[PDB]
Amino acid sequence: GVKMSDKWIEIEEILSGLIGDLTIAVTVLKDYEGKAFLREPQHQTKRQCIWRLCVYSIVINCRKYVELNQKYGKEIPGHNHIRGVYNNEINKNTAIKKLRNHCVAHVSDKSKYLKPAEVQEEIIKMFDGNFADEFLDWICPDNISTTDKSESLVGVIELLRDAVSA
Amino acid sequence: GVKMSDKWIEIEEILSGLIGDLTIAVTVLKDYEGKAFLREPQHQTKRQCIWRLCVYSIVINCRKYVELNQKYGKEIPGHNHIRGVYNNEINKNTAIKKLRNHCVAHVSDKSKYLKPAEVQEEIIKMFDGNFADEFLDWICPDNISTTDKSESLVGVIELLRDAVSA
Known part of the structure; x- marks a missing residue:
């Protein structure tokens, strides 16, 4: 029959998942980048595989953040702006959607390959170049605790989650 | 205009990607499981995030293996059987598709959530229980070199790649 949508339950869930998945993808990537020997030629394939593992997850979740935004203008408005800023950065960076689409597409669907x-x-x-630091820090900086939460995707997503928990 | 499909180029590519992505997801997961402190209660969220990172990648790739199979009965037939066996195991294990679908679905598409x-x-x-060893070893065992390549998904996928390289 009919029921309440419990939108807000779903939203808290998704936000929480986003925080954890974006944070862990960055952490894992940084962990492996901390192993210098992995930059040697005989490890290129393996190293690339690590990058795809983490990057695919980041792009899938960045897009989810946008999709959540486009589904729920039902959002707390004290943060209405910072949210649109991060929403906009993601759209601007078209490699994100391109990578997501490829990674997720069906084998038979070669329009996205x-x-x-x-x-x-x-x-x-x-x-935006050969150095990951900027973008990674923009997703989730180390010790995000002592950090202006306006200054990273994950901090912003946490700004919303914590508000929604009310 | 019209051209040759270079099916075989695409197939070598995809197979190669499958080998690397399945192998790395298992390796990463095992690496982190080797850190005992991560099984403590204060790390549950983080630990779960690692499991989702690796499991989502495994399920996405297991499904890709099936999708590749259903698209290319143009396949070397000396291995025609082992291939269908692994193809079948994956379909049988319906959690795989369920997880893939959720992980990949659009936020607005809640039929798969x-x-x-x-x-x-x-x-x-x-x-199939509380122990990952069996399934992980079935995807990609340690030192896959000294291993009957019929005995793991990745070995089988390597059986095909190597043949296709000809």
């Missing part, structure tokens, strides 16, 4: 060299290019575009 | 407790249940179903 990126060849391996293309995936590599898209990853460089996403990070 | 699993609540957090449901995701946890599905993960236990996938592993």
Whole structure:
């Protein structure tokens, strides 16, 4: 029959998942980047596989954050602005959607397919160069505790979760 | 205009990606499981996030293996059987598709949505219990080199890749 949507339950859930998945993808990636030997030529394949593992998860979740936004203008408005800012950054960075789409597409759906060299290019575009620090810190900085939560995606997503918990 | 499909190029690519992504997801998961402190209560969230990271990737790739199979009966037939066996195991294990679908679905598409407790249940179903060893070893065993390649998903996928390289 009919019922209440419990929108807010679903939203708290999704927000919480976003915080954890984005945080862990960054942490894992940084952990492995801390192993210098992985930058050697005989480990390139393995290293690339780690990057895809973490990057695919980041892009899937960045898009989810946008999709949540476009579904729920039912949002607390004291943060209405910072939220749109992060929403906008993600759309601006088109490598994100491109990577998500490829990673998630059905094998038969080749309209979204990126060849391996293309995936590599898209990853460089996403990070805006050869250095991951900026983008990673923008997703989730180390010791996010002592951090202006306006200054990272995960902090902003936490700003919303905590508000919704009320 | 019209051209050759270069099916075989695409297939070599996808197979190669499958080998690397399945292998790394298992390796990462095992690496973190080797850190005993992560099983403590204050780390449950983080530990769960690691499991989702790796499990989502495994399920996405297991399904891709099936989808590749259903798209290309153009396949070497000396391995025609082992391939269908692994294809069948994956379909049999319905938690795999369920998890894939949830992880990949659009936020607005709630026909596939699993609540957090449901995701946890599905993960236990996938592993057929509280111990990951069997399923993980079935995906990709340690030192896969000294291993009957018929005895793991990744070995079988390597059996095909290597053949296709010809």
